[PDB]
Curated annotation (Swiss-Prot), chain B:
Gene that specifies this protein: tagF
Function of the molecule: Responsible for the polymerization of the main chain of the major teichoic acid by sequential transfer of glycerol phosphate units from CDP-glycerol to the disaccharide linkage unit. Synthesizes polymers of approximately 35 glycerol phosphate units in length.
Family: Belongs to the CDP-glycerol glycerophosphotransferase family.
Residues reported to bind CDP-glycerol: W131, N132, G133, T134, P135, R199, P233, T234, R257, M258, H259, S299, S300, D304
Coverage span on the entire protein: 313 to 721 of 721
The protein's name in its UniProt record: Teichoic acid poly(glycerol phosphate) polymerase
EC numbers for this chain: 2.7.8.12
GO molecular function annotations of the record: CDP-glycerol glycerophosphotransferase activity
Origin superkingdom: Bacteria
Length: 410, 395, 411, 409
């Protein structure tokens, strides 16, 4: 009668008798053991189960094609609101079947921290794609984290606890690799430098004019107009009035309409909270709201340029060697020249920094003149961050997972 | 304000859990079980501590299934997989989490035996007891000594009383019985229901419905050219089969029915088509319908069966070693009392002389014990419940 | 880290503490009890489940007091206040922490009656059982049916067997008992010690101590010029009625015994405790002396000229003195008719006559010497069968065995 | 009718007991702690979380011993075998089955610090918080930020609040302190008893008792005709190096040379400096007095005190003697600061010295200082010490007495 089973035992009795929602958890913690692991089961969860998206979707769509043999499971917050191509079955987070899947699977494929109350036995391979080349410093490399209810010492403790269980961690480049090694308490031995499976499309399908054409019309865009994508990161600073009416984006849509409304159409990819607060009346067929569009890689494929500021997306869009524009209107805030960035923002990035929208809007007319002026910085930016990606990432992982559960079949 | 009972049920449950006892199911139920778990539209049935789909609960249930089909029905069995139940009723294995939930939720318990004391009969649940026959041998309270297995005469009665107090309604077959029940079971006449037994329903409504009698007989594989004798001894070879075969094999076939277990020792080889073992058959009342006479000794089947005003024979081989019954046994019963089988056989050879010779003693018996059965009984319980579950489904 | 049995105890003790149960002293005793607790020179005495300071324990201990004041002696009592103990021994109340400390710590347990199954007799301690006398009524296993509510015949026997399997040593007063014991108690002859009862010691060593007889005699305020009869019926339930407030005078007819024996006898009445404090001996003063309370019955014998009893284990102890006995069995023609509930043959091999009526007992009881003579026949042969094995050294044999035990347990 | 809370405690306790956890005594307490266990005649005392027999709980106790011997007194300690209590009182060890009994039964809790939140203060018991001094540094609610590990500033404050809500009465030294407690401790002013510290009664009743002074002086083997300087600096975490020193910044060696003849100096250091302090060759000059069981006595026999950022200044103030504030490290402390409730730069009873040589040459003439600052010294007394009338010990014990009378009916 072991002291660890006894604690998990009493915990569960309390959950069962008190009608706690976690009884599902407490049960799972008890019965869990190596023997439940069917080597041909794979669970996928993307961004903590909000979506069917990103790199697990592609590590998935690849395996569905070349390895339909296996049991595929997807984990979701709300499974009845998620469309999944293929054989895979879906599970609601924190339910019976959720802990089942996770107990039984021989491979965890995920792109974000998966919870700690889930048991990753010495027996299951947990593959971590993570979600992008870092620009803001993260995990260990942070300095202070006043995130409510926890302390910097403790939030790093738990994060280290998670990374410790990552059997594999994907990396898009030598710069991310060097960062993860420190930021994530990672051994170089465990890192795969293969590029992002979500980015696979950015190499393989970028000139597939039919695919480009579906996406365009799925979005209902003018057939004659080029496409700008604007994806500003979030700012607590700018949240006012409970979120009922915001000051028209500091980019000035009215102007953008005036100046580009004839050649261009602009895609707004905002944080989900600015999205259902942004009224786009009389911008119809000019500014298209694109914030909830499931797959971002597709939005890049049909974009002639990206306007962002401080985001890990510029590193993705980089693969297409198109012109970027960094509209850092609030840059004066951010530390006056911050080491809070792994890279030199001021110097090496593929486009101009604008602090005001009007200089930007004029330059945004003649894109071809922008591609010239910057072919220099753009190429150099491609060399450094985007050179690893060859569109074989989904293949590499799916094959790994295959190479893995063939040995295990003995 | 320390809740002293709850604390005991907890420790118990915490101990059943750690030592991995089978009763973990039970200590949970006992801890968790609140009056709020009760679903008005949920009714449980157990028959004979859950060996059968049989008897008064079957019939009460088969009735309710047709006229009140919307209620949720649960049956309790020792082994559900070996029992087949008609209709929307779901089965539950005993001592299983499903068993306890069932009994905790149920608004009505229907049984014909004692339900266990570890089960809690709340103030808002209605426990209907049908019991299981008209008593001959003394029972419950009225018993003198009962050196049962690992129990004392009082600790055994102390417990019966704890059981009979839980009974909200107790079904009675005949005045004779109600008088006995009131003492035997500590009961108050209010809670008693002199309405006959639901199980006997068919013994009035279907005694002449012939196609039915013909489905029973061919469901058993019986010779079309033979009268049927049913031997239902009672409790723990004697009748001389070899002799009954040489005496009766040309007019009769004989059904042998036990109460317990001896059955798989009756190697009836060479008595095929004559001695039919009918021990494991479900509905006894059916057997009576196709039975031309019945041989018994001290069973209470003798009162149920008497309802058909057929002949009975009481083969009391062990009467000498029995000195105490609620009625005068030597004197007034519907048939001859034989202590050897050899004169039983000869007098069983002509059934009609026995009928006339006893048609007076038969009627006297019918008019005492069977003058109460309508066949409406089954109905009357079904209704009672339905009624009892509109009240508890309103204000 | 946790074994299954200690868990059960742990949880019991939790229930006792939170719920404020008096048994808490026990649940604790049960957790904390271990072989390392034993003090080789601590010995515990209890007699008749702790009601008394009496019988074979008293004597085995009085011997050890004189010849071994070195050891720790603890006596057990229901009420240690109401009992007087001569010497070094300390008193402990049943069910107090002391009680359990004592029984946990003791290297030896001396007793003359079943000690509770809840106490743990470790592989470590020696439990000497003296028992309380030669059987006439069949006991323990040899019983047929035993309907004392709370327990069934096989449960009762199981519980008995458990307790005797714990007995390391079982004193025997004679081979008659040894025969019986072996069966009734599930005994292995190895463990039986035919040495005679320690309480009976003084029935040998001191049958003549005329300053001793005189000390007892004047303790009871007994007349100077009168012989002593002692009546000592067993308990019979037939007679309990009316709250036990007022009983029906003794069947033996006192008013008669007075008329007949008064001028020459004083009769000691040793009744049950319930008949005593419910018996009006007014006007019988100096003839009938109530004696049911007296602590030491062996002393009562030493000073008795005859002994009227009926079916009691006492005839055997008394037999040691080769004195006349009478067996006033006024209700014998109820007991079985022909009784197999007794081991010995009653109608035959007892040392005096059987009377069913008091009246001829009283007469015949007039000339003692004519009975001592007429019956010397049976009286001697009775002695040879039951009393031949006592030598007055029983206390000393048990004293020395214990000592010899806690000299070995001293290494 | 399921009692959910009781169930939780029952599980917790079973967990502890089976797991052989040292806290079994705690979880049993909590399981059974009923409002009935309280016995009106019982009073528990504890000072500074049971490290001492000292401070105001002491003086409240010693009073109630002279006038109310009737009651049951219990003292809580960490290590009772190492503490000595005059009188009837019984001693319990902390977290020991007796400890929890004591608080279970007691009708009154007397303490000068925080009592554990595991202990249940029933609405049946009166909890008297004497606290431990006029605050100079901002505390509890008024604190800006507390990076003290395991716990964040919100959760640290949240717990301090949980505690102060169980304070039935809270003692206050002065109007300044009362305004502060009302906020810093989330207090209802109705619950503040402005009577001064019982620990400071002796500073009023016994400053003139020459036989008392002598006992204290001969208890500390003090030379005879030497004046007495007392040094009591708060705890600097910065000044700790090499497993624990650079000779105290005050320079004893200079202090010896300038004062050796006429003064003896009492060092009241923090326990960790104290057993790191080598005094080889300052005997009969520098007396380590760090573990002296009663600080207010030390005040009585001191002709002046050198402190810095300590609450002690407020207490030594009742005596109107000179004070010096050797605040050498005042640089590091905010430059021009607001970390303190009062203006540390303006309205204290003495000179601020950042070097200990101005201090030395000034300590030479004690008459001169007294004259010089008599004004500042009086404006200090008027503000912070005008309450202490030295009947504080009495006022509290008489409330406790009054309090347990009303119970007995
Ligand atoms: N050989 C038998 C005897 C009886 N029964 C069935 O079991 C019932 C009980 O009959 P008893 O022989 O009297 O059994 P008992 O448990 O002794 O009940 C007697 C007492 O309950 C009277 O109410 C009968 O009505 C009948 O339905 C049966 O299947 N086979
Ligand atoms: O083991 C138990 O369940 C008893 N304990 C355990 C508490 N629960 C809380 C939880 O579910 O997170 C289990 C535990 O943490 O050990 C109750 C208590 O200490 O509060
Ligand atoms: O064995 C036990 O732990 C004690 N209980 C049995 C366990 N259950 C049953 C009960 O409630 O009677 C309760 C308990 O664990 O305390 C009965 C007893 O006191 O020996
Ligand atoms: Cl372990
Ligand atoms: Cl598999
Ligand atoms: Cl979630
Ligand atoms: Cl859903
Ligand atoms: Cl893990
Ligand atoms: Cl990232
Ligand atoms: Cl966290
Ligand atoms: Cl690099
Ligand atoms: Cl806008
Ligand atoms: Cl319902
Ligand atoms: Cl089954
Ligand atoms: Cl117990
Ligand atoms: Cl010893
Ligand atoms: Cl006592
Ligand atoms: Cl034992
Ligand atoms: Cl013999
Ligand atoms: Cl509980
Ligand atoms: Cl009191
Ligand atoms: Cl200590
Ligand atoms: Cl002390
Ligand atoms: Cl303070
Ligand atoms: Cl120094």
């Amino acid at each position: 009668f072991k002291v660890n089973q006894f604690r998990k035992t009493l915990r569960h009795v309390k959950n069962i008798v008190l009608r706690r929602k976690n009884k599902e958890r407490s049960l799972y913690d008890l019965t869990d053991k190596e023997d439940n692991v069917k080597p041909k089961t794979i669970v996928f969860e993307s961004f903590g189960g909000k979506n069917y998206s990103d790199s697990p979707k592609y590590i998935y769509e690849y395996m569905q094609k070349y390895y339909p043999n296996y049991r595929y499971i997807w984990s979701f917050k709300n499974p009845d609101k998620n469309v999944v191509p293929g054989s895979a079955e879906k599970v609601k987070r924190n339910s019976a079947e959720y802990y089942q899947a996770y107990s039984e699977a021989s491979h965890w494929v995920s792109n974000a921290r998966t919870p700690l109350y889930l048991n990753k036995k010495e027996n299951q391979t947990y593959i971590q794609t993570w979600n992008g080349t870092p620009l803001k410093r993260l995990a260990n490399d942070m300095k202070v984290v006043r995130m409510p209810g926890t302390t910097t010492p403790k939030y790093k403790r738990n994060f280290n606890r998670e990374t410790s269980r990552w059997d594999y961690l994907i990396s898009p480049n030598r710069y991310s690799t060097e960062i993860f090694r420190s930021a994530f308490w990672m051994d170089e031995e465990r890192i795969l430098e293969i590029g992002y499976p979500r980015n696979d499309v950015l190499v393989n399908r970028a000139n597939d004019q039919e695919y480009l054409d579906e996406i365009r019309t799925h979005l209902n865009l003018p057939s004659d107009k080029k496409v700008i994508m604007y994806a500003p990161t979030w700012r607590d600073d700018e949240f006012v009035s409970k979120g009922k009416y915001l000051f028209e984006l500091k980019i000035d849509l009215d102007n953008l309409y005036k100046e580009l409304g004839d050649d261009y159409v602009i895609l707004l990819r905002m944080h989900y909270l600015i999205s259902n607060a942004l009224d786009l009346s009389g911008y119809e067929n000019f500014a298209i709201d694109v914030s909830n569009y499931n797959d971002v890689s597709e939005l890049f494929l049909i974009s002639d340029c990206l306007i962002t500021d401080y985001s890990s997306v510029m590193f993705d869009y980089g693969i297409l060697k198109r012109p970027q524009f960094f509209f850092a209107y609030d840059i004066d805030k951010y530390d006056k020249g911050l080491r809070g960035f792994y890279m030199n923002y001021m110097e090496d990035l593929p486009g101009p920094i604008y602090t005001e929208p009007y200089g930007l809007a004029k330059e945004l007319k003649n894109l071809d003149k922008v591609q010239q002026q910057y072919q220099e910085k753009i190429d150099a930016f491609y060399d450094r961050f985007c050179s690893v990606d060859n569109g074989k990432a989904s293949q590499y992982i799916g094959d790994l997972i295959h190479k893995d559960i063939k040995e295990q079949l003995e």
